[PDB]
Design a protein around this nucleic acid. Structure first.
Length: 113
RNA sequence: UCUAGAGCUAAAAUCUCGACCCUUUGGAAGAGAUGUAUUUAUUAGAUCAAUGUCUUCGGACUCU
């Protein structure tokens, strides 16, 4: 999946296509708000600290903050209707995984920092 | 007309009382007294004048 990475200290943001399953496996069953080191994910991510922020799945249904259940469910959403809601928890059926940098480590990213 | 995360833009015045002073347009010291809505309970929401009448011509009487 893709990592929509933003760096708000400079304000810039950039997506990275990640196809290797060893890289994505660190993010599995992790939740929005949790602190994630991508140094296991990648050697260029050495010392980085990431927080999961949001994203979508392969059908557009977003992860909503702290609902539960990493499958998809249907909720009474805001004069209130019902739509389908993909859960808060990262699974392999995510098309993307948007996150945010918390602590910076050693190496640099040209289009990001 | 689906969505994600990021950085921005106390004082008041009026009411009554008036010590008084002053004769004219009269004028005043100080003595006090007063929230709006809402809610329940409590509170308020016999007489006088004569023209009647009597009289002793001074006045008395409210029976009509």
């Amino acid at each position: 999946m893709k990592l929509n990475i933003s760096y708000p200290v400079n304000g810039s943001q950039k997506t990275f296509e990640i196809d290797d399953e060893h890289r994505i496996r660190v993010f599995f069953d992790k939740r929005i708000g949790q602190e994630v080191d991508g140094e296991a994910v990648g050697d260029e991510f050495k010392g980085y600290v990431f927080k999961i922020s949001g994203g979508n799945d392969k059908q557009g249904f977003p992860m909503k903050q702290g609902v539960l259940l990493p499958t998809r469910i249907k909720l009474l959403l805001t004069e209130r209707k019902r739509k389908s809601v993909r859960g808060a928890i990262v699974g392999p059926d995510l098309a993307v995984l948007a996150l945010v940098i918390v602590k910076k480590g050693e190496q640099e990213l040209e289009g990001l920092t």
